[PDB]
């Protein structure tokens, strides 16, 4: 099996925040509570961080992880700068922090598993101190459309299958 990690972690990227560390794994799934020197960085989702935090210092381009559709591409979306493909199980990948003004690609777009979707980058929605990183977060289907849902949900990617959503589109 391989996962959106796996594929990252073969092309350098290396992983800042690993849901598989949180206390209690595999309970109480993206329980994090990160904050430090006065930011609740966890704080919209009642603490959950239900995704991983990867970064290279290689390069900025940023991969898409799986083919799909390009359903979101917001510079000043929840995760500042932010892309979601739509994958073929209709899943929604979420690249968060992305330098705004770099995204490839617009809604609607057709997205091959490996284009470069965008810059690695720190920007968020109030604009706070950031380490550069990209949030990479596998928000299911079932998402309910109210907004804590639509952020703060989440798949375990490191048990997601990616190996068959890499179709040309
Ligand atoms: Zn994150």
């Known amino acids: 099996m391989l996962t959106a990690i796996d594929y990252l972690t073969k092309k350098g990227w290396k992983i800042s925040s690993d849901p598989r560390t949180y206390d209690g794994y595999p309970k109480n799934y993206g329980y994090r509570n990160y904050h430090e020197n006065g930011i609740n960085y ?8 239900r ?7 290689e390069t900025n381009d940023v991969p898409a992880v799986t083919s799909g559709t390009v359903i979101e591409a917001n510079d000043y979306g929840n ?8 994958d073929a199980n209709d899943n929604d990948w979420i690249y968060g922090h992305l330098q705004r003004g770099s ?3 617009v809604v609607g777009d ?5 284009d470069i ?9 109030y ?18 459309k109210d907004e804590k849902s639509q952020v703060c949900s989440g798949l375990a990617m490191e048990k997601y299958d990616i190996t068959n959503l890499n179709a040309k589109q």
Do not use: W
Not at 42 to 49: A, L, N
Not at 51 to 57: E, G, H, Q
Not at 110 to 114: A, D, I, P, R, T
Not at 117 to 125: A, E, K
């Open 42 to 49: 966890d704080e919209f989702c009642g603490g959950y961080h």
């Open 51 to 57: 995704a991983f935090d990867v970064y290279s210092n």
């Open 79 to 86: 995760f500042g700068g932010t892309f979601v493909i739509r």
């Open 103 to 105: 995204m490839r690609f």
């Open 110 to 114: 057709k997205v091959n598993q490996g």
């Open 117 to 125: 979707i965008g810059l690695q980058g720190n920007s968020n929605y």
């Open 127 to 144: 604009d706070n101190p950031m380490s550069v990183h990209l949030h990479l977060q596998l928000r299911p289907k079932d998402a309910k």
